[PDB]
Amino acid sequence: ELLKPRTLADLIRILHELFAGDEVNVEEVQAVLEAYESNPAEWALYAKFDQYRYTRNLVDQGNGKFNLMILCWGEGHGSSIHDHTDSHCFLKLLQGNLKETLFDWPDKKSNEMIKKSERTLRENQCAYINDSIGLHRVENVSHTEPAVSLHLYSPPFDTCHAFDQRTGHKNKVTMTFHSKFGIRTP
């Protein structure tokens, strides 16, 4: 029975119940993520920025079923065009705004990747993506406001592909955590 998360800690407890089985009810996970009202005091520990690019900060390992992490986006910071390695990916805004641009999977032929759509994700909104939906790029286009987002990936993954927008060619990238459980991990 899906109740409103009172705090980040309560949210994490609810997610462990939702991921207790072998499958994922996407709409229920999205609904509970959206229902958590961002409270900056609860996640300040994980919000560790870098001057030059966005940072990934591990919050919870989900008893092995999912990774929950906080991403911190300085002004102008963005991602590659990327896939999600056959995982579910949920993205909830905790602070600021992010622009999400969707792309189709490239064809074998080298060609410019054209965007299919774009939207602005605003505070407390939760977006969802998986490989069957397509690829995306996520960017903080603000010149004045850092953004902070809460990401849930199931199953967890530590590698994905980055796509060259000019050709559609991909390269495997291994992502690293900036911090884990509030502790910087160089």
Q: Which residues does the annotation place in the binding site for Fe cation?
A: 82, 84, 136
Binding site: residue ranges?
A: 82, 84, 136
3-state secondary structure labels for all residues of 14-34: HHHHHCCCCCCCHHHHHHHHH
Neighbours of 86 (CB within 10 A): 10
